[PDB]
């Protein structure tokens, strides 16, 4: 029975290696990674891989791994797929821990923009969880943490992390991770998956996929939002993506809104993530 080596980058930056049978469905690999992580609340997570166009794709757990990675390496990342709007309602501290690890990468990477003060507050909770109580022996006036807090580090940010860290004495790791999440969940780009697109006029926009629906970002003052319950049908055709909106009260007709994506693969990828969000957040 022939097996393929899988390499999975974990949220702590380490690499998990295992073997699966070459005809294995994605769920097989996911279940092994989740067992390695001691993770029971698995529904919020998934594996990503890079396609031949180097685009991030979710590994479909119902489909053969070989039919998704195709010509590419069996190399994957473990990631948050569905960002819970209220992390306090998760049943296990370890779920909140992996969510914190994902959000730290969202922040450092610039995917999750954040004010100075929120960067410093999130950093201070990470330091409290991982090192415990502030110690002045491991931090003089010139201290720079090993922890990555932001897409661009400044001395002023390091100073502010330490000032807030001092305020958290006695705080336990689950308590600090909960505080981290209570702040992170309020950021305007929390759990927003962004897709470059053009509107039916050719104007460049972003489409954001998240718990609260499909968001359209246009010119700054011009942004729209379609809550999932309002969306009856999601479809794609060639380079185009379509949402069918419920008729408004007393309106005779449904309305169909169309967008242009970079290529057919990008339209199909946006369709699949929208359908998956629509199903998940309908049930959660
Ligand atoms: C770090 N390398 C040894 C293998 C690798 C490369 C890329 C990904 C992804 N996704 C996972 C694993």
Swiss-Prot record:
It is found in: Cytoplasm, Cytoskeleton; Cell junction; Cell membrane; Cytoplasm. Residues 4-284 form the FERM domain. Expressed at high levels in brain, with lower levels in kidney, intestine, and testis. Detected in lung. Interacts (via FERM domain) with CADM1. Interacts (via FERM domain) with PRMT3; the interaction is direct and inhibits the protein-arginine N-methyltransferase activity of PRMT3. Interacts with PRMT5. Interacts with PRMT6. Tumor suppressor that inhibits cell proliferation and promotes apoptosis. Modulates the activity of protein arginine N-methyltransferases, including PRMT3 and PRMT5. This is Band 4.1-like protein 3. The chain holds residues 107 to 390 of 1087 of the full protein.
């Amino acid at each position: 029975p022939k097996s393929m080596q899988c390499k999975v980058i974990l949220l702590d930056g380490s690499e998990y290696t295992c073997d699966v049978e070459k005809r294995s469905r994605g769920q097989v690999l996911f279940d092994k990674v989740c067992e390695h992580l001691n993770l029971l609340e698995k529904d919020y997570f998934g594996l990503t891989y890079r396609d031949a166009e180097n685009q991030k794709n979710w590994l479909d757990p119902a489909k053969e791994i070989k039919k998704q990675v195709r010509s590419g390496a069996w190399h994957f990342s473990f990631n948050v797929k569905f960002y819970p709007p209220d992390p306090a309602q998760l049943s296990e501290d370890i779920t909140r821990y992996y969510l914190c690890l994902q959000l730290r990468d969202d922040i450092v990477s610039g995917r999750l923009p954040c004010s100075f003060v929120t960067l410093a507050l999130l950093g201070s909770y990470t330091v409290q969880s991982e090192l415990g109580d502030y110690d002045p022996d491991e931090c003089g006036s010139d201290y720079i943490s090993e922890f990555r807090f932001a897409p661009n580090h400044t001395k002023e940010l390091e100073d502010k992390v330490i000032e807030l860290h001092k305020s958290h004495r006695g705080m336990t790791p689950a308590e600090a991770e909960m505080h981290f999440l209570e702040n992170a969940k309020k950021l305007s780009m929390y759990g927003v998956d962004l897709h470059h697109a053009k509107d039916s006029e050719g104007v460049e926009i972003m489409l954001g996929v998240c718990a609260s629906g499909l968001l359209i970002y246009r010119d700054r003052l011009r942004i729209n939002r379609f809550a999932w319950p309002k969306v009856l049908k999601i479809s794609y055709k060639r380079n185009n993506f379509y949402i069918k909106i419920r008729p408004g009260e007393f309106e005779q007709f449904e309305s169909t809104i169309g967008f242009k994506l970079p290529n057919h693969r990008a339209a199909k990828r946006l369709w699949k993530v929208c359908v998956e969000h629509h199903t998940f957040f309908r049930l959660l």
